[PDB]
Amino acid sequence: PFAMQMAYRFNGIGVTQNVLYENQKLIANQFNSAIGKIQDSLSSTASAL
């Protein structure tokens, strides 16, 4: 499952995994906001390519 995989990637940078299971909704929200920011700094005329 995906949350159990995210917990191991947290464990791999030095943070424990209860930190991910406690803050799970906040982390999922921050990821969704960052993906949405990508997709409209791409749709504008900012030439990153």
């Binding site: 949350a3 159990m4 424990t16 209860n18 299971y21 406690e22 799970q24």
Partner: protein, 55 residues
């Protein structure tokens, strides 16, 4: 490791080789209450100082 179930009982195993062992307070740690984790499961954690080693 990971918590796994064989259908009836619950064990703890390492990730790249299946080798199930009994969940005691030596291979787990404690943090928090049972209402924040999404998907927590009711089982029992064995205390390895109380089989008979109460003197």
């Amino acid at each position: 490791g990971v918590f796994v179930s064989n259908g009836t009982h619950w064990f703890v195993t390492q990730r790249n080789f299946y080798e199930p062992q009994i969940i005691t307070t030596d291979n787990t740690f404690v943090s928090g209450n049972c209402d924040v984790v999404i998907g927590i499961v009711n089982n029992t954690v064995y205390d390895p100082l109380q089989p008979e080693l109460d003197s």
